[PDB]
Amino acid sequence: GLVPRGSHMETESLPWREYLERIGYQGLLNNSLECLRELYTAHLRSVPYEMLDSFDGTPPVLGHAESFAKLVHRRRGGNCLESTPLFGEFLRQAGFEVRLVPAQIWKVSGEWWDAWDHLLLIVTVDGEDWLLDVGFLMLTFAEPLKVAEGPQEQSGWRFRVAEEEGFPTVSHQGPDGTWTAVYRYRDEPQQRADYEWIIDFHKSAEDSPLVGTLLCSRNVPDGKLIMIGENLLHARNGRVSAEFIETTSRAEELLRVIFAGHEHMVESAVRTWEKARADRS
Numbered sequence: 001g002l003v004p005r006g007s008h009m010e011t012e013s014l015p016w017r018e019y020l021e022r023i024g025y026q027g028l029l030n031n032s033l034e035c036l037r038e039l040y041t042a043h044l045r046s047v048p049y050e051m052l053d054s055f056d057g058t059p060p061v062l063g064h065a066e067s068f069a070k071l072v073h074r075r076r077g078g079n080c081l082e083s084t085p086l087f088g089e090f091l092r093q094a095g096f097e098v099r100l101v102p103a104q105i106w107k108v109s110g111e112w113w114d115a116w117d118h119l120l121l122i123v124t125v126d127g128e129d130w131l132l133d134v135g136f137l138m139l140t141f142a143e144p145l146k147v148a149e150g151p152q153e154q155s156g157w158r159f160r161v162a163e164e165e166g167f168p169t170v171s172h173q174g175p176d177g178t179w180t181a182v183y184r185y186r187d188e189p190q191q192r193a194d195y196e197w198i199i200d201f202h203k204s205a206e207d208s209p210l211v212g213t214l215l216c217s218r219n220v221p222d223g224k225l226i227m228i229g230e231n232l233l234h235a236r237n238g239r240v241s242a243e244f245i246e247t248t249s250r251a252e253e254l255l256r257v258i259f260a261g262h263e264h265m266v267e268s269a270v271r272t273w274e275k276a277r278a279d280r281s
Helices: 008-012 016-022 033-046 052-056 064-073 080-093 197-204 248-258 263-278
Strands: 097-105 118-125 128-132 152-154 157-164 167-173 179-185 215-220 223-228 231-236 239-244
Touching: 008 064, 016 064, 016 080, 033 080, 033 118, 033 128, 033 215, 052 263, 064 080, 080 097, 080 118, 118 179, 157 179, 215 248, 223 248, 248 263
Parallel strands: none
Antiparallel strands: 097 118, 097 179, 118 128, 152 157, 157 167, 167 179, 215 223, 223 231, 231 239
């Protein structure tokens, strides 16, 4: 057009009304914690996590205008690079005090992923800091997590932030009562130039987890449905169950739930699910 891409002009004139429509928030906005809670919940329930476009190795674009177009106009799903900075920018323009910070994810195997390639938001309301994550595949807090000591209960689970080996670390309490890290972060405000490297990291990576795989998930009231390849984790009310998905018929059943209200994405997701199952036999 006439407005240069990535200019402050471009991001400033994004039509946030359509964004709020896209996430199913049709009320009034203020800067109370209660408004922030409702916005977070709306995003989480309305937007599935998905990486379908990267199944090839095609990188996501990073600009706010490009993220906006994919999420709002094409009604695609979300992830850390394409959802979280855009949401942070929406909150900033709606008047919240917001900080985008880098994070490193804890593997199910029991070590850290090599790269600090996750991102979190910290929102400051009435002198307190609150964590928000609208770009995470697996189970994390679905209500803003306070940056304070001690267990915080949410939908039958307990989360906490605690300082561990030099880093504020978000953990989740297991059925035993053991705590397992979800991710740690650094309180270092990021702009686009600071996290751009993530794209080249995954281009350069051998066997990137975000390429050649089927990864999608959807928050539901009191839990979350997570599909990782041929496995489904059903998190619900403090309990998680697992199911090995045996047929494309059963995979499609589950993808229709994860992508409820996003039925235009199902056939591509099913195709991607089969391609990835086959490409590991």
